[PDB]
From a paper:
Herein, we describe the activity of CR167 against other β-lactamases in A. baumannii: the cefepime-hydrolysing class C extended-spectrum β-lactamase (ESAC) ADC-33 and the carbapenem-hydrolyzing OXA-24/40 (class D). The structures of OXA-24/40 and ADC-33 in complex with CR167 and select chiral analogues were obtained.
ADC-33 crystallized as a dimer and OXA-24/40 as a monomer in the asymmetric unit. The sulfonamide forms hydrogen bonds with Asn152 and Gln120, mimicking those formed with the C7 amide group of the cephalosporins. Additionally, the terminal aryl ring is involved in π–π stacking interactions with Tyr221. The smaller methyl substituent would not result in these clashes with the enzyme. When compounds (S)-6d and (R)-6e, which differ only in the configuration of the stereogenic center, were compared in ADC-33, (R)-6e (Ki = 3.7 μM) was found to be more potent than (S)-6d (Ki = 22 μM). The structures of all three compounds extend in the R1 region of the enzyme and no additional interactions are displayed by the hydrophobic chain introduced on the carbon α to the boron.
Numbering used by the authors: 1 to 360
The structure:
């Protein structure tokens, strides 16, 4: 006999701990939640030069996992009657009325099907006026709704519009409404001075300390959130148990679980990627392939609406890596946070190995 917490720690040691030496990663946090029990595993240093250990207070950058909070905020505003996903952005950002982008609906912005939005804002797009000009000069390429092209400006505009519909800045939408509704205590769009001692350095591919800095304000819905391992386990708990939360945030969480279309084996939900469960490892790897992440792909309507499903999301910044995954009917999920990027495939593979080996 070996206690469960030790069995899970041994599986994380076997599958995630070797990644630290393999990719010269300073620090890592891995959390598993199973049947509402949380297991937290911390490795390495949040700051190499300060010899400061990663711990339950360490704040990491979530990168594109930030989009899951934007999606939740959108689900919240929709089920509060503040927006319809059939609305267009010019209904809320009036300067976009009578522009081509005002033909694209909010759901299409949130799920990357406008037809002509690239992965990033151009480097020169920094001010609010440059963002306005960027979207005013947008013209459709592909037929709207036909093609998925993963796009930070696309979901950034969605987040800006959600915020406008709630009459507050997006940072306030998350920090004053969504994070508290989810019970998160150390999640931020802007880390306060009192928490800077807990904000890990990111480390670039030369193991030099860095931190996210760039992009316009309206990129924050795409990659601007920072959080801790306990907070991300609470967020997974909320996604596994939405019925335990008040009606408004319950409905918001459920909105993010609804698949909207497919590209091959991947269901695009709001923020989350969704898959039939059990999913093959290759299905999960394909979601992060160059073909899916970097190129436009024709979308198809959902045919099989999976009763039994799983969800995941990767995220990265220059100096950080994130992976979150959960499986509702196995009552289980996992979060990985690192302060150095490692290949997405390694994150997915390690999590797959751990989750499949944990005893039910």
């Amino acid at each position: 006999n070996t206690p469960k917490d030790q069995e899970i720690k041994k599986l994380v040691d076997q599958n995630f701990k070797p990644l630290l030496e393999k990719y010269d990663v300073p620090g890592m946090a891995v959390g598993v939640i199973q049947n509402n029990k949380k297991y937290e595993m911390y490795y390495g240093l949040q700051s190499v030069q300060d010899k400061k250990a990663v711990n339950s207070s360490t704040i990491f950058e979530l990168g594109s996992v930030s989009k899951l909070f934007t999606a939740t905020a959108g689900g919240y505003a929709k089920n509060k009657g503040k927006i319809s996903f059939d609305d267009t952005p010019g209904k809320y950002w009036k300067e976009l009325k009578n522009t081509p982008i005002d033909q694209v609906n909010l759901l299409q912005l949130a799920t990357y099907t406008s037809g002509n939005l690239a992965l990033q804002f151009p480097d020169e797009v920094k001010t609010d006026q440059q963002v306005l000009t960027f979207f005013k000069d947008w013209k459709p390429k592909n037929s709207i709704g036909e093609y998925r092209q993963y796009s930070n400006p696309s979901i950034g505009l969605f987040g800006k519009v959600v915020a406008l519909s709630m009459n507050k800045p997006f940072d306030q939408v998350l920090e004053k409404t969504i994070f508290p509704a989810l019970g998160l205590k150390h999640s931020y769009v802007n880390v306060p001075k009192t928490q800077m001692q807990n904000y890990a350095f990111g480390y670039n591919q030369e193991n030099q300390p860095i931190r996210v800095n760039r992009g316009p304000l309206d990129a924050a819905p795409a990659y601007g959130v920072k959080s801790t391992l306990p907070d991300m386990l609470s967020f997974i708990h909320a996604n596994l148990n939405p019925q335990k939360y008040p009606a408004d945030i319950q409905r918001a969480i459920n909105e993010t679980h609804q698949g909207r279309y497919q590209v091959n084996t991947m269901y695009q939900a709001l923020g989350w990627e969704e898959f039939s469960y059990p999913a093959t490892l290759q299905t999960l790897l394909d979601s992060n392939s160059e073909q899916i992440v970097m190129k436009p792909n024709k979308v198809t309507a959902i045919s099989k609406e999976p009763s039994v499903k799983m969800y995941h999301k990767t995220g990265s910044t220059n100096g950080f890596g994130t992976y979150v995954v959960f499986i509702p009917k196995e009552n289980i999920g996992l979060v990985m946070l690192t302060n150095k990027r490692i290949p997405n495939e390694e994150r997915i593979k390690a999590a797959y190995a751990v989750l499949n080996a944990i005893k039910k």
